[PDB]
Design a protein around this ligand. Structure first.
Ligand SMILES: [Cu+2]
Ligand SMILES: [Cu+2]
Length: 444
């Protein structure tokens, strides 16, 4: 029998308003073969940290790895000080406590290491967790909300394992250029698991947690997916799609119908991306089996989900140009491999800016991620974004063309705890396709 889909623990504050995350190495089993793996509160992956908008919490982070790491909250609008980029080193055995004061809409964000030059490796070893942000608005909506029953996180990741069963990761020249990818697909750490889903609506919180592999979700019998949310939260209304491309580090929440008899698979369809159509990803590849069950179901598909603000006039907005490049081993932005002691520029706090990110000059896929914000895509690789990508995003496709995003940073980031903007193809990031920027002013 297929293993059941592991469900990350939905982790809330304790009585002292704290959350403990312990980073550790342990063992996992894949295809009957044990492997050393890393996890948060466990041997692999991590919990779903549940936060409420407007309610500050403290997170105590205990690094019990023998090596240093950082803990970055991907998609969270937080000050640079708690952003957990490459300057937020947690030494081995170290502890760091951060205050998260969430001030953004309900969304599924995530967290992962951001160690300079080792982000790819540390994610590959198993470290990743989720952040479930709720607010008053979403809780009014009657969406499926039984965690691990009809509201299910789906963290999809490939890994490359050596013949000894261990995770095989080396940042060699090939891996640096094309990315780290493998022939084994995991769904919350499990190979082709099954999920028992109540008849009615099933909500999947999809995260592409791969280092380098882009995905394209569909169902085996071509029943539609109704996209209800993107990286930064709810769409205004559901967007019905037959397939759903998801770039590295992107989240989408979809609703899918479950009718009593027919089990079906969520699958990923072959993508046009260097390395990624190699077997077994040359064909539609199962991600997980949905098995209908006859237990109580908590939700439906609302006709309207939220509001999206109108895009503002662009006149007078600061424009920033970011040129991605790959000059062999050296991956760069504006002709510079990432320099931790030199932020490329100082962004304004609380002001819309237009950032123009170009991948002209190479044909590789660069999902470009900007810390400290949820932005609106104005142009995605030469076209206005698709309906389901037109809301709140922290990632924009850059692939041989030019993208334009409308960003606003609500929180300070000084030069000592700067925000990152980078390609989220982790091997590019680690080999220099990243820049630091500050937001606001600062005086100590
Ligand atoms: Cu991030
Ligand atoms: Cu890239």
């Amino acid at each position: 029998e297929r293993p059941t889909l592991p469900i990350p623990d939905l982790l809330t504050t304790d009585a002292r308003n704290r959350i403990q995350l312990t980073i550790g190495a342990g063992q996992s089993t894949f295809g009957g073969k044990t492997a050393t793996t890393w996890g948060y509160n466990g041997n692999l992956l991590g919990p779903a940290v549940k936060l409420q908008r407007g309610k500050a919490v403290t997170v105590d982070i205990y690094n019990q790895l023998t090596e240093e790491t950082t803990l970055h909250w991907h998609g969270l609008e937080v000050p640079g000080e708690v952003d957990g980029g490459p300057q937020g080193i947690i030494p081995p055995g170290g502890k760091r406590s951060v205050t998260l004061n969430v001030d953004q809409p309900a969304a599924t964000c995530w967290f992962h290491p951001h160690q300079h030059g080792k982000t790819g490796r540390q994610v590959a070893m198993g470290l990743a967790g989720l952040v479930v942000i709720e607010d008053d608005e979403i809780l009014k909506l009657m969406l499926p909300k039984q965690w691990g029953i009809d509201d299910v996180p789906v963290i999809v990741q490939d890994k490359k394992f050596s013949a000894d069963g261990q995770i095989d990761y080396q940042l060699d020249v090939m891996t640096a250029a094309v990315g780290w990818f493998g022939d084994t697909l995991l769904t919350n750490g499990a190979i082709y698991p099954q999920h028992a889903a109540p008849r009615g609506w099933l909500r999947l919180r999809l995260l592409n947690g791969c280092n380098a592999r882009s995905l394209n979700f569909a169902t085996s019998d071509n029943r539609p997916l109704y996209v209800i949310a993107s990286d930064g939260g709810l769409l205004p209304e559901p967007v019905k799609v037959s397939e759903l491309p998801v770039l590295m580090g992107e989240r989408f929440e979809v609703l899918v119908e479950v009718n009593d008899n027919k089990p079906f698979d969520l699958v990923t369809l072959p993508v046009s991306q260097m390395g990624m159509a190699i077997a077994p990803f040359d064909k539609p590849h199962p991600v997980m089996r949905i098995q209908p069950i006859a237990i109580s179901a908590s939700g439906a598909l609302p006709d309207t989900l939220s509001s999206l603000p109108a895009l503002p006039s662009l006149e007078g907005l600061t424009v920033r140009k970011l040129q991605l490049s790959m000059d062999g081993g050296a991956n760069k932005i504006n002709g510079q491999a990432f320099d931790m002691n030199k932020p490329m520029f100082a962004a304004a706090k609380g002001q819309y800016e237009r950032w123009v990110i170009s991948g002209v000059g190479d044909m590789m896929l660069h999902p470009f991620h900007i810390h400290g914000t949820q932005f609106r895509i104005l142009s995605e690789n030469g076209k206005p974004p698709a309906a389901h990508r037109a809301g709140w995003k922290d990632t924009v496709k850059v692939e041989g063309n030019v993208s334009e995003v409308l960003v606003k940073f609500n929180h300070d980031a000084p030069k000592e705890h700067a925000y990152m903007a980078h390609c989220h193809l982790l091997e590019h990031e680690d080999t220099g396709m990243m820049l630091g920027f500050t937001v606001g002013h600062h005086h100590h």
